[PDB]
Each structure stands twice: as C-alpha cells, then as structure tokens.
C-alpha cells in the first residue's frame, strides 16, 4: 500500500492550496540516531523522535518559504529543507524536506 | 509503541494556513488499510456512498465553530476520491469549541 501518497492526498483535502504534498513518509529514530542528529546540529539540536519525509509542490517561492518557516518557529519541530526545483510545465516548485518532531508524545500502553 | 496518530495530528496542525489560523485542529489521525472483503462489505452497506475504499483514517479533532466543522465534513464529500462518516460532535463549554470524531475513506483513485 503506497501509504505516503494516501497520507499526502488526505492532508491536501483538509480545507484551508499553495503547498500540496505528494508523499508523506514517517519513521521513528533510534536513540543513537537521535543522538547523532542532535549533535550534528540538525533540527537545531532538538531531540527528535519522529521524522516525516516530505515531497511536495508549491505554487510560489514565497508559499514554500512560509511553509518552511512554520516548522522553524516551534520548540516541538525542526525542518531540514532538502531542495526545490522549478517545474515550468506546471508553473510551480517541487520540493523536498524532512520534518522532525520532538519525542515525548504519550499514548495508551 | 510510537503513538503515530498523535505525531501525525501535530504535523498536520503545524502546516501553516493564511492568517496563522487553524479552524480545525486534529488530535489523532490513525490510518489503516482495508481487506478486499471489508471494502466490499462497506461498499454494499452504502458507507462512504458505496465507494470502494482502500484506506481509512480515524479522526479525533476540535473545530473552532459549527461552521468550521461543516466545511471540514463537506471537503470530504465533494471529492470522488474520498468519503466521510461523521460520528459525532460535542460543544466543550470549557473552551467554547467543538470536539468531533469522524472516519475518512480513500479510494485507490
Ligand atoms: Mg477531540
């Protein structure tokens, strides 16, 4: 099941579309990997538990910049902007990014 | 193990909307894939307008107003790829907003 695409389609349907997602893929980090990343300075040294790898499309440069910034201003998120490309056939930018979320979420167990 | 449904809700709530606002906030978003049998039974039962669903998202959320909740529900009815089953909503008089629950079905497309 192409989960990443279903999750993207579901997120794009939520009414507000300047930034649409193509794929949203989640993984949990080992404590060792989280340790390495915090020390490497990625995600501003926050202790990330979960990473969402994103591929998306932005109708303008400025919409992409707002999207990236939203994940920089929170104590619970970090973002690594991996890249963007102009798509002249569709008049938009494709882009990729990894969003880290700090550990400590609780669930029943 | 990892409470994915909370990390995904938080990620979705972080995606910026115009004005910095969030008229619907998600608290839990769980996904699951349907066996062919279950999709066949749901379709015959008329759930999700008889579309044959491939993935189902179970949602717990909060809506700023009755009108925000109605817009959220309708977003998932006006698309050929989605159906929604609205389970319920309640006014939280401590906060002056609505909690709600719903299931969203997604087609193979
Ligand atoms: Mg709720």
Automatic annotation (TrEMBL), chain A:
Residues 3-103 form the PilN biogenesis protein dimerization domain. This is Competence protein PilN. The chain holds residues 95 to 207 of 207 of the full protein.
